[model samples]
Target: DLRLHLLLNTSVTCNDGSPAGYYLKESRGSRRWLLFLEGGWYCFNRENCDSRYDTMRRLMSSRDWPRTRTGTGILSSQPEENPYWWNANMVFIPYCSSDVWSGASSKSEKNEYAFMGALIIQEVVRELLGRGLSGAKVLLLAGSSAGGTGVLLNVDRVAEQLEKLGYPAIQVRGLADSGWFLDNKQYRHPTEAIRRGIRYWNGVVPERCRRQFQEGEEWNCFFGYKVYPTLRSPVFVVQWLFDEAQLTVDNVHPVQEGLRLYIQNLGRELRHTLKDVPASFAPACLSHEIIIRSHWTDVQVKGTSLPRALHCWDRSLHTPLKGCPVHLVDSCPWPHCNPSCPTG
Candidate 1:
C-alpha cells in the first residue's frame, strides 16, 4: 500500500545519457483507479485497444502527448507511462475478442478483433511483469460482456492447467459487467438479445454471417459460474441488478414454472447472492467497496475471495452518494479501497 515506489521512472535520470527525454515531470498517483476501459464488443476488441496503446508514438506524431496533472483529465491527457497507480502487484487481463468468437466469430469480417484479444493477453502479461519486475507479483484477469464470455468459458480451464504446473504466485481473477452468458435454452430466442450483441459491437459482422450466430447452449460467463469455485486463490466479481441478462433469458437465471425464476438461476450459489457473495468468497481481509462516484465503487473479490455486486452503475433512488453495503458489510471510499483490495 505505498502510493508508488517510483522505480525506473522517466524523470530526468543520467542512465539515458546527457539529454534526458526521461526527465519529464510526473503526476501524483491515485490511491485507486477503476481502469474504466470500454470492452471491445466486436469492433472494440482487444486488438483495437492494443493497436492504439502500442502505436501511440506513431499516433501522436503530430500531436502533443502530455501526462495529466489530476490523473483523470480530458483528451489532452495521454495514458500513463504505466497505468499502474500503485505499481500494482497483480493484474486482471481481459480476453481477446477473437478468442471470444472462437465458436461464433464471423468468417467474413477481415477484422479479427477477438483473435487479437486472445493474442494480446500474452503481451499484457509480459508487460505487467515488467522488464525488472520481481517474479512474486501476479496479474489477475477479467472481461465484461464478450470479454466475460471469454473469461468464464475459457480461462478456468487455462487456470487449472496453470496451477497444476505450479505457478501459484501468478494469481488470476474475473468480473463480468452485466454478464450475458447462459446455457443455451430452447426458445424462439430473443432477437433483442442477439441484437444487443450486434449493437454492442456496432454491427461489425457481415450481413450473411450475422444471421448464422449459433447462440449456443454454452455461453461465456462475463462473471464466474463454473470457474470461481475451483480456483485456489481468492475470486472476484461485479454483477449488476439492472443487468437483466442473468435473471431474464440470457444469463444464469430463468423461468420454467409460471414465474420469472427470480434468483433461482443463482443455482446452488444462491447463498452467494449479491448481499453476501463477497463475504462468502473473498477473505474477511478484502475490501468489497470501491467508490468511484458516491454511488458506484470499484467492486472486487479476493482470494478464497468473493466477487461483489452493485445495484446499478448509478446510485439508488433513496441514497445518492452513500454506499448500500456500508452497514450491510465492509465498505470503504475510493482510492482508500485500493490498498485494501488484494494485489499480490
Candidate 2:
C-alpha cells in the first residue's frame, strides 16, 4: 500500500490558507478507481470554523493523528474484504475545507481562507487525469457522512471535468452513505441552517436547484430531495431509514411518534429521489453509516445482504436493471456498529 500526497494546485487552497493534498494508494492490474471523500460535519460559523481548523491542522500534519487509511466498504481492495472493487486504485481526499467539499475561495491575500472545495475537486481531477485516471474502466465516487453529500454534489462535476480534460467516464457511478437529507419544509430549523450554510461557505449549488425555488430556494440543492432527481450518472445510495444524525435531540432515543413520522416521510421522499438509482439499501436502524461498519453483511433488504446487493447491482449495470425499487429491510433492529446501530 503506497501512500502518496498530491498537493492542490495554486488555484485551490483549504480553509486554513495552507496547501491541500489528497492521499492515494495505487493498485496494480486494475482500471477501476474509487475516490473516497472523508467527512466531518460542516462549519458555518467563525467560532465553529476556528475549532474545526485546529482539529484539521492536527489531522493534516501530525503523524499520530487518527486517519482512515485502510479501505472499507466498496473502497476495500482485498479480495476477501470487498469483492466488488477489490484491486481498484483508491484516492482518499481528506476533509480540510470544513465545507463538505462544496465551497469556493476568495483567493485574496488577506488569508481569510477561500473555502474552495469546488476548485479542489477540479484540480484533483486534473492531477489524476495526468496520472491516467481517464483510462479507468469504471469509477466509483463514494463517501460517508458529510463526505457522502460531497460525493453527490461533486459526482456530476467529476465527469464534467474528465470531458474537459479530453476523457469521459465510460462507466462512472456514485454511492452516498448516510448523507441522504430531506428538504422538508416541516423541518424549518435544519433546512434554514443549510440555507445559511450555502451562503456562508459560498458553496456552489446546481442550476436546476435555483429554478426549483421561487426566489430563495437555492439551498434546496444541498438536500438530496431536490438534487437526486437531477443527477446524471447512476448512483447507489446506502443508508439507514431512521438516520440517527437526522433525529432531533428530544427524539434521538426511543423512536417517538414525531421521529417515526419524520422517518416515514424521509422514506417516501428517498424512494422518489433514488427511484432511478441502480440500487439502494435502506434498512431500519438508528445509525447513520452502514457501508464502513464491521457487520456490513448483517443488514439485508429484501433478503439481499449489502455486499451481495452491491455486487448484484454492479452486475446489472452491464445487463441493465429497470424499475429497480429501493430495498427496505424491516427486520428486527439488528446490531452492528454498536448496540443501537444495527444497519450502520
Candidate 3:
C-alpha cells in the first residue's frame, strides 16, 4: 500500500518545485501529516526554511517530544535536515508551501493560503486511501513560526475535508517555536496592522482595498480572519529564550531575532506601498512568530493535541512573550535545548 506523503518543503508551484527534496520521498505509512514550510513564499526551498522546523524537530526529539509533557520535539533527521527523514513512522506526510501560500490579487490571500494547504491535504488523502489504507488518519503537525498559524488558518478545513473523505483525524499538534498568537493593536485597528496585512500579499490588493481599511472594513477582515473559529486541536506549543521573534528578552537579540527582523521589515514595506497596489496585493507578513501566535486565545480545539505530560517543553501554546497574554516563561528553568527537561 502506498503511504500518503504530503510535504510543504518548497515553493507553491501549483504546489510543486524548488527546495522540496523532502516531499520527493515515497509514501510510507497510513497516518498522514501535512507540513507547511515557512518563508516558502513560492521562492524559498527546503534549504530555505532556514532549518526552523528541522531545528524544532531536532530540539523536540532531542527531548523526544510527545513524551510525558516534557520532550522538546527536536529530531535527528535521517537526511539530517529533512524533517520527514526524522519521523518515518507517520502513515503519510505530504509536503506543500506554507511560505508562499498565496495567489494573484489579495489584500492578503487568507482563504487561498488555507485553501492551498487544505487542497494538498485532500490530494494526499485521496492517493493514500487509494492504496487501501482507508483507515488512515491525518493530523496537522506544525512547528516554529507558522506552526501555530498552520493550526490556526488550516486545521478546520483539513479536519472537515478529512472527515468528509471518511478519514478521521487523529490529532493536530501545533509544534510551534516561539509562535505568536495575539495582536496588541488588533482591536485598536492600527494603521500598522493594515499595512502589515497588505504587505503580506506583497501589495497585490486593489487600491480599493486600502480605502476599505481606511473605512475599517479591512481591519474587520483582519480580526475576522484571525478570530474565525474552526475545528479544535490540542496544541503542543514550544518556545525558548533563544527565540527572538516576539519575546523582548533582555535586549540580547535571541535566535528568533532574525525572524523578527524579517517580519518587521515586511511590515514597513506594507505600510508604504499598500496604497499604490491592489488591495489583494497587500502583504500580511506570515513569518512573524508574534503575528502568527497572536491568536492563541482565539484558537478552539477538542481532541487532545498532546497530553499535559507531553506539553512542558512544548511552549507552542503560549509563553511569556511580547505577543501573548502571559508572562510566565521563567517558570520553566531548564536547558533551552535539552532533550530531557528535568523540570518545567
Candidate 4:
C-alpha cells in the first residue's frame, strides 16, 4: 500500500519549519528501490523566498501535504505503465526546502529559513535502512526539473553516503529528466541567480566538482553540464531537444524567425553538452518534463522509447557486451519535427 512517512525523529525540516516527509510504496520481495524527488522551481533570495512562501507555500511548508499520494509514470506500479521498475519499492520525496536539494543551513534569526534539502535526503536514507533499504541490490535516484538537477548534485554523494553507512554493495544510479539546463550567453545567464542561491541557502555540491572551481564560483557545480563530468555514479539523462523551461528562462518566444533560431541554437548546445553522456534519451520535442507525464512512452528518439532506453541501460549494467541501445538522440534540428511528439 502507498503510505505517508514523516521524519518525526530527525532534525530535518522544510523551509517553513515544518516536518519533512516522503510517500512510499513498498515491495516486499523486490530488492530494487526507486526514490523519485518531487520538483518545484526554487526561490533564490529573501525577497523571492518571502514571496514564494506567500504564494507557493505548499512547496515551502508541508503542513498542508496530503497523507498519501498515487504514483504516476515512472513511479507507476502497473507493469504496462512502468515496465522495468514496476515492482520496485517506490519512494516519492517532496521538495519543500526549495534549495534544489543542495542546501544545508538551518533556520536562524539571521536567515529565517531552514535550508535542509541535502540533509533530508541523508535522513531519509538513514530512516529507510531500518525499513527495507538495507537489503536493496540497486537504488535508482531519479528526479525531474529542479529535482532532476538535484539528482545530478546528489547522486554521487548518495552512493558515497550509502557506502559510508556500510551498504557498499547497493549499486546507485541517477535518472535526471529535463534538468540539463544550458548556460547560454545569448539569453539571461542562470549563473548569477545560482551564485546568489549558493550564498543565500548555503548550498553544497559534490566535493569532486567543488574542487574544480574557485571559492566564489562553487555555483558552477549547479549546472548539469559542469558537474556531470565529475560524477562517479552512472546517470541516464532524459531531456527534450527544445526544452520549454530553458526557453522560458531566456524569455524566448518561438513565434518569430529570430526566436526560432534561438531554439535551434539551444538544441545544438544541448546536443553538444550531452555528447559524452553515453546513456541519454533526447528527443527533438518542445516540452519540459517527461518521466512523470502519461504520454512518456510516446516520445522516442530513433524509434527507441524512453522506457526501452532505460531498460536497455539497466540491462547493460549486468551484461556490458550485449550491445543494448542506451544513447538515443534525434537528429532533427527543429521542434515538433518528430511525429511521435505529443500534439496539444
Candidate 5:
C-alpha cells in the first residue's frame, strides 16, 4: 500500500519554502529498500524560486500536492511486474529544493529562501532508518533526471549514515538514470547554471568531496563522471547518448558533429570514472528517461537488453563496455515520437 509521511521538522522548507514529504510503499516481507528521488531542475535565484513556487509541479508540499505516481519500471509492486525489485521497501522522495537534491539553506537569509534538497534527504533517510532501513538487507538508491543526479551526489553520505547505524554488513547500490551531466563549459555550453546552484545552495558535500580538485571544479561533485571515482558503493548508470534534456537545455542540433562528440565524451568520462569496475548502460536514442518508458526492454547494446544489463550489474556481473557499440531502439522514432528529443 502507498502512504504519505511528513517529517517532524515540518518547518524544514523546500526551495520555495513549501513543506516537504515522502511517499512510502511497504514490501510484503522483504528486508530490501529502494529509495527514489523525484526530479525537477534547480532555481539559482529569488526570481527563479519565485517562479517555481507558483507552479504546481515545481514546488511541492505534503499537505496539498497531488498523489505520487508509482507502478512504473523498477517501482512496479507485483513480483511478476518488476522481478528485479518487486519485494523491496520503496520510498519516493519528492523534489522541491531545486539543487539536484543537495542544497543547504541560510539562516541569516531569513528574508531570502534557500534550497534545502540535501537537508531533506538526510532527514528522510534517517527517519526511515529508525522505522525499517536499519533492518534492510539491501539498499538501492535510484532517481531519474535531476533526481538521478541527486542519487549520485548523495549515495556516499547515505552509505556513511548506514554504516554509522550499524548496518555496514548490508549491501548498498546506486542507479543514476539520465544523470551524466558533463562540464560543458569548454565547449561554450550553458552549464554555468549548475555552478550558480552550487553557490546558492551552499553545497557542502561537493565542496568537501572536491577539495583536492582545482578551485573551479566544485561543481564537478554534481557531475557523475567527476564524483563516481570517489564513491565506494557500486553505481550503475542508464543514459542516452543524445539525451533530450541536454538537447533542449544546451540547444544541441542533431546535425552538429558536437552532438555525437558530447555523447562520446560522456561515455569516455564514465569509463574513466568507473575504471575497471564498469557498470552502465548507454543507448544511442535521443530520449531522456528510461525507467518511466515502456521501451526500456527493447533497447540493446551488442544484443544485451537494457533490463538484462542492469540485472547482471546488480548481481556483480560488471559487464564490460568493450565492443559494446551504442545501439538505438528500433521502435523509437525519436524526434517525432518524443517532442523533447532533438531532430534535424
Candidate 6:
C-alpha cells in the first residue's frame, strides 16, 4: 500500500509566489530513483499566463495541492502494474511555473510572476541527494506532455549536474511520453510560441544544443527532433503518432478532408524524425499522454508494449538482450489502426 506524500519547499516558489512541492513515494532500500515531472501546458506571454492563472490556477499555484497523491501507470508501485522498477524511489514533480519546466528567471518588478521551473528541478535533485539519491545506481527522469518535453531539455543537464556533485557514476535516462511535437507548417507553428516563451521565461536549453543555434534561435532546441541529436544521455521517447495536443493546437478536425490529410502527414513527419532515436514507442493512436494513464500498459507498437520496450532498453544499457525490441513504431497509415488502441 504505497502512496505519494506531498512535500513542499519554500525555497522553490511557484509562478504565483506560492511554495513549490513534489509528491514522493520512497522505497525502504532502493537506490534506483524515478523522478516524474507533472505537465500542464504552458504560457508564452503575459496575456497567456494571466489567462492560465485564472482558468488553471492549480497548475500555476500550489496553494490548493492535495496532501497525498496516488501513483498509477509508470509511477505505480504494484509489481503487477509496473513490472520494471516498481519499487524504485518515486518522485512526482508538480508543474506550476508555466514554463514547461525550462524557466530559470525569478520574480521581478518587470514581471509579477516567477518562472523558475528549471531551478525547481535542480533544487529537488539537490534535496534528494541528501535523502539517499547520492548513491543511486540509476535515475530515470520521465514525464508526460510538457513534462515529457521537460525531460528532453533537462536530462543531460541533470547528468552533468550529478557529475559535478561528485556522483558521476549515476546513469540518467529519459522517458518522454507524447511530447515529440513538430513545428509543421500545416499546423499552427510552435516556433512563435516557443520563441516568446524562451524570452519571457529565460528558458535554459542544454549548452551543447544551444551552441549550435544563434542567440535569437535558441528556442529551436525546445523542439524534440531539433534537440534529440545533441542529447548525450540515453532516452526512450513514447509518443503517439496522432498526438491530440498537437492536433488541438492546430484546431484540426478529422472530419475535414484537409485536416485528415494533415493528420496523415503528421504521422509521416514523426516517423521520419524518430528514425534515429533507437529507443522509442510510437503507436498510431490518436491520443495525448499515456504513461500516467490507467490503461498505459495496454498500448503497443509492433506487438511490443511500452513497458516491455522500456524494459528492453533498460537492459540494453548494460548488456543487450537477445531478440529484445526497444525501438517500436506502428506501420499503420492512419490513427486508431492498432487494435490495442483505446476507443475514442
Clashes per candidate, residues 3 or more apart or on different chains: 30, 2, 85, 0, 1, 0
Q: For residues 82-145, what per-residue lDDT tens digits would candidate 1 score against the true structure?
A: 2222233322332223234222332235532213333233333333334322243333344455
- Top candidate on lDDT is 4
List where candidate 1 sits over 4 angstroms from the true fold. Answer: 1-114, 131-138, 149-168, 175-177, 184-223, 230-232, 245-295, 298-344
lDDT tens digits, residues 222-248, model 5?
777767777777888777655777666
Task: Rank by TM-score, highest first.
Answer: 4, 6, 2, 5, 3, 1
Look at candidate 2 and tell me the lDDT of residue 250: 22
Candidate with the larger lDDT of 1 and 5: 5
Residue lDDT tens for model 3, 39-151? 22222223423353354332111122221121112222232233222343333222234332222221123432211433343454455445443543435345434334334
lDDT per residue as tens, model 2, 1-344: 43646464654666765666666777757788887877878777667667766766642232333344666666666666666567789887777677777888654764365677777767776787667676787778888888888877888887776777667544667888888876454543366566766777788865555666645676677777577677777777876766767654224447567655665675555556555555677766666776655456666666657777677676676644443334444443332322334621
lDDT of 2 at 257: 74
Reference-based lDDT, residue 230, model 6: 94
Which prediction has more favorable TM-score, 1 or 3? 3
Off by over 4 Å in 6: 1-9, 187-189, 254-257
Ranking of all candidate structures by their lDDT, best first: 4, 6, 5, 2, 3, 1
- The TM-score that candidate 6 achieves is 0.95
Backbone clash pairs for candidate 4 read: none
- In angstroms, give how far residue 144 of model 4 lies from its true place: 0.4
TM-score of 2: 0.83
* Residue 42 CA displacement from its true place in model 2, Å: 0.8
Write down the TM-score for model 4: 0.96
Question: How many clashing pairs does model 3 include?
Answer: 85
Report the lDDT of model 3 for residue 233. 45
Candidate 2 residue 262 C-alpha distance from true site, Å: 5.3
17-76 in candidate 6: lDDT tens per residue?
A: 887877878886888899998898899898889999998998998898887778888888
